[PDB]
XYZ file of N, CA, C and O in Angstrom:
36
model
N 2.051 61.782 2.248
C 2.797 61.649 3.522
C 1.866 61.155 4.606
O 0.784 61.703 4.793
N 2.305 60.116 5.308
C 1.475 59.371 6.240
C 2.266 59.132 7.512
O 3.272 58.417 7.486
N 1.790 59.690 8.622
C 2.463 59.551 9.896
C 1.473 59.104 10.951
O 0.402 59.696 11.106
N 1.864 58.082 11.691
C 1.109 57.569 12.811
C 2.028 57.525 14.020
O 3.126 56.959 13.949
N 1.589 58.130 15.110
C 2.306 58.087 16.375
C 1.353 57.603 17.443
O 0.289 58.200 17.649
N 1.725 56.518 18.098
C 0.906 55.910 19.125
C 1.774 55.632 20.337
O 2.803 54.959 20.230
N 1.356 56.147 21.492
C 2.087 55.917 22.724
C 1.156 55.341 23.774
O 0.039 55.825 23.966
N 1.631 54.308 24.446
C 0.920 53.628 25.516
C 1.771 53.800 26.758
O 2.854 53.215 26.857
N 1.280 54.611 27.685
C 2.012 54.994 28.891
C 3.451 55.361 28.545
O 4.408 54.953 29.199
Protein backbone atom coordinates (compact mmCIF):
# COMPACT_ATOMS: atom_id res chain seq x y z
CA UNK A 1 0.00 0.00 0.00
CA UNK A 2 1.42 3.29 -1.21
CA UNK A 3 -0.03 6.71 -0.42
CA UNK A 4 1.33 10.12 -1.30
CA UNK A 5 -0.38 13.34 -0.25
CA UNK A 6 1.09 16.64 -1.34
CA UNK A 7 -0.51 20.03 -0.77
CA UNK A 8 0.75 23.39 -2.01
CA UNK A 9 -1.01 26.22 -0.18
